[model samples]
Target: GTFENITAAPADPILGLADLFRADERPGKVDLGIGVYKDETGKTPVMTSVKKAEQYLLENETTKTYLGLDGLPEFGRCTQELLFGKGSALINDKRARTAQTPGGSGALRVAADFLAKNTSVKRVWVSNPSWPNHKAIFNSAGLEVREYAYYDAENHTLDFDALINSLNEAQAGDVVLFHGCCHNPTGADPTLEQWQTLAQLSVEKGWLPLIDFAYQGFGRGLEEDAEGLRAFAAMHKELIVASSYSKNFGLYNERVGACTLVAADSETVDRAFSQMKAAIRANYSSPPAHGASVVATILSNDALRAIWEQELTDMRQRIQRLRQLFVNTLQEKGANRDFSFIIKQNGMFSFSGLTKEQVLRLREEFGVYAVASGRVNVAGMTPDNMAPLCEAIVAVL
Candidate 1:
């Protein structure tokens, strides 16, 4: 049989652990495994601003018509404003074009589709320790995936020199993917000056820079997080950005994201956007109408926009606070290693430097669920869970 030949696929690296965590009937099974943001209550809440937007949509939106191939125009516009700053020259020059997609994952697939269908760019270079799904996504699009040096696991830092040297191997017309900000698994990122060097490398090497910006305001402030992408964009003539509102807007289930292409001129942007539309058309036909509509409603209205940012502020602050708190607790426990580096890392994740065996021990003994790679979702911690979480961690250490 056509289906019989195929064996069952294994579970996902991140979500697989989540499935296991859910099945275990433990009292305090701390889940620092999943990437999603959990508040102090250990719940992923719907943002108050998002609720406001939804209520507005229910009353104002009259139709559930498909948002065409490019999705909602206003959603694309406001998303472009978010990615490239309000005063960004890219926007001023009309070089940036955006198409809303299902989620950041969809955005990546669309970019991958574009590369596979539209361009001759054969190879894609990703960071050595990039998000686990990156290689799979690009490979599914029939692109060859290679890795450039990035995280120094032993030192728990960015090996900028090794990264530069590795990137030097990428040929002209290859795609070099960067985290934009808030690097996953390994939470280290390059400084603003380091970003400049990367831009220079892209220029000298003649490789296309594709930035995946999933967690915008989670790493730093909204504007600050955009700095690296902005730095790269200002110097480059062409760029592809895959951005997500999942984390920032608390619209994960809504599957909201955008794929933005920046060209040297508006005419090229217009020409390329047609192909972007074609990619979306062949894949999902069109993105979900509700998520884009809600996003546009919030971003376009100043009052709603302020509320969203305030909520976003609270979430980012919480993640940062958890990072500090985790490190402090580890320090207070008189653990063997210095966890100060965890405080320096950004976004929802930080590599706890725990081995796979230790991770297994944490799970089997104490019901503390963490990814085998030692990647901890800092946002999962709360005042209540802190004591037991740290106790389990130090016990394992």
Candidate 2:
């Protein structure tokens, strides 16, 4: 057989748990496996602003046509405004350019391809407990992947000392992947002062930074969340950002994301953008228009932009409340460990620090689904499931 020689790949650690949860017949099962935001219905519902945008698009329909290799001009421009802030130097001087991508991961791939093909970058450094896909994307680009310490699981804290110690090995031609806000799986983020320290390090070490900004508004306010990345942008002459509207705008299925490149000057950015376009062209060739159009419409329109900001606040506050209640409930139930740290963490996920055995026990006994690494989506927690979820967690503890 043509495919007989190929070996079957291993199941994805994150998605596989979701598949297991689907087959389980346990009543009142709390699904915290996937990273998607769950609503009152315990599903990733469409955002209110996006629904309105869709209505607007449907009403003022135009011809189905292809966009340029860079995708929608407004989408690119609006995304840059969101990233670097309105009227920032990069925006005013045209030192940055953005290309619409299939999804957040697609943005990472595009950047990776650009690095692999256009530059001398040969090694990509990622945080030890980063999103698993970071390694996969860089590795698939034929770059050597290395890990720099970020999280100290035993202490349940962001270990700045160890991270700095590890990253000292980074030299020229090495690209480091920094989570812009809301580090996935582990919700711990560096303090603002720590961000400054990293910026200084990058300036001194001369390593490239490829920030994966998947959850821009999930951590805090949009402007507050970008503060860390902006710190790097202040010092580094060149950097790349993979922006995602999946969580912030609820455009997950729409696959709306972007690869934003910032450099020293307009010419440098234009040249780099040319390589990015070539990379994108050889892959997906042309990006889909509808999703990017919706993004363009919402960001560019004042009323739509306000609607999105409100909706983003709703989601961020919801996640924060859930994290608080989770800690309160666990402490009320007298769990084995102190969970107050959860309140300080950002984004949808938190590394519960549950042992592998405890995770398995929670699944087999309590019907609470989570990644084996103890990463749970706080968005999966709703008022209806809070009691049982807390009980399940306590039981496992």
Candidate 3:
């Protein structure tokens, strides 16, 4: 068909919604539509540590030579240590390969592209309520995708039994994707014991594990959130893990991320690294250097690292506080809805379980915008408008 015969493609689910939200002129409008962070002042802010790192780079750095396809080795090494523990067996075994990517989405795309080309694993299993882009990226990479049970809408929690049961049905060599922590959209995640169970399943079933880790420090803590990835890496003979610095380091626009592949031996790790490098070379040639350098500097330096950790803590704590305040405000307003799930669900998103009609009413009547699938970004809530927001939610329902 000629260019004139081409039909219109659908707008991207999550990002496309952002376009619509941006055009709305309602004064009371609250955009819980997107997963990005909003501070206590209801603004998305760039971190001060990032700014400082950039300033330092501007002063000391001169040559802008193109980096290798694998990107800065020191950045990858630091990120690998940060994702897996410093003394992790995975690191000691030298079985993990890390390649710099644009961001979490870019990391996933690279990994997906690698899998599509290298292995017989054609179909990937993802959570039912995963980040919308997961499906889009995998599909774009020409891999068939299957869905496993994750968030239980009725109970408003992780459906553990159903999740494992669905995975058990997969044949050997299929790719199974797991959210590392602080699941986007749904905000429900499994416990440590459940993670161990998943590890055992991966070993028994011979399925490849691909863990998407975007929000690390946004969840419990830096160390605590890495537990699942570490455990999975230990059990699986081979796995793919993608880590993003976008959220934690607040380098969203800079597109900083890494895709780490863990194999059974150093040889396989090296081979995987080579293949990943070739993929990046064929696609984008190399990732941007500025963001990776900034992240690496902050993580490597003691004082800057400490400051970054505190900033992460402040952000996490503020989101936690907002979650509690939202639920309590709903309760205080004498709303009959349980509203307990918001507090239980961690990180930036809350599976509010608001039905499509209710969500639509929220947008039309109260200027509160959220996904029609009942998910809301809790980080968008703030002290100044908590009461009114609660009232609006109840009113919409």
Candidate 4:
């Protein structure tokens, strides 16, 4: 019995599909399945600023010592500024604590673990079609997960009244998960007024809002993308945020991300830090050093930071262009279908509103790949492939 085999683990629904796409031998096969960014050349290239920073580090930096139990000092500061804005009230709050983690996923896991152990929280609320990893991560932490109505399939917009009703059901101390920007797998986000209402609900219910902020610069503009997070942080007394630099800075593999906990005062921040350090001690002991260093270097400098901003702006615009083109191409292909939803949806993804059967047809018949939920990585599509993709999509429909 001591040596008996246990049940096999299931493949990761999202990344696992990526692995399958990689193994396919078809040369012309298109992949819109993964969430990461791909250039006009259809490749994920490291940023120029990152490469320069790495070179600078190699030339001037010494010692590969482990960073603090939390992480690099600047990571928390820079990421905090990025998420909550430069001089946000949340940042000025003495009770805010930030700890660097592997990536957005790592930050989420850490937050979930902390919530499960620290609070009397019974369940975490997520959107009905939230990121696939959200379910797996929450379950791994042994926390109950609940789903509220989010995406309305018929109109392809947010189901607002139902969402508010669902939030009303959450008790104090429960966690309500929110996409800080660019809601994944469904590209649908609440309007400013809607976010304000949600913030009011969080305040009234005394529930903690756990925000997943993975795609900030990938959305509208950087500041525009962060507006919702800034609004919530300013309005709510207690909040937890997870920030990722993978997409914005194109630092995917270095696992550069942070978990930020905000309370009403300084004493709570100190306690949060102590608990987060203990969590790290129990897990990996320390976070990675290189990626955080690159991010800190660029964000802290003036010239490099300016260049990075422009580069990010370019990436955001390119994705926006593709979103419009994809929809326009569909219409021009003699299909009288309404695809205006794609234009309305911002960020690097679109929910497409394609049925499961249509998604399957996209894969099997057209050599095009997207999530089964109809989430297309708009960043993965390019000008070269746009027409063909549109043809493929129109044909499938």
Q: Give a tens-digit lDDT track for model 3, residues 39-59.
A: 877677888888888888999
CA-RMSD of model 1: 1.3
TM-score, predicted candidate 1 vs. hidden true structure: 0.97
TM-score for each model = 0.97, 0.97, 0.96, 0.95
> Roughly what TM-score does model 2 have, to 2 decimal places?
0.97
Assess candidate 4 and give its TM-score to the true structure. Answer: 0.95
lDDT of 2 by residue, 1-397 (tens): 9998999999766667767888999778888887788876877777777888889999998777787898989999989988999989768888899999988889999999999999999999999886788888989999999999999898889999999999999997799889999999798999899999998899888998888999999998899999998998888489999999888888888899999999988999999999899999899988888888899989888998899999889889999999998998888877888988899899999999899998999999999988888999999888778888888889877
Candidate 4 residue lDDT tens string, 147-222 = 9888888788888988888788888988899998888867788888888888988888888898999988877888
Ranking by lDDT: 2, 1, 3, 4
- Model 3, residue 159: distance off in Å is 0.8
Off by over 4 Å in 1: 13-16
Q: Candidate 2: where is the Cα deviation over 4 Å?
A: none
Q: Where is model 1 poorest over a 10-residue stretch in terms of lDDT?
A: 11-20
lDDT of each: 0.88, 0.89, 0.86, 0.84
RMSD values, in order shown: 1.3, 1.3, 1.5, 1.7
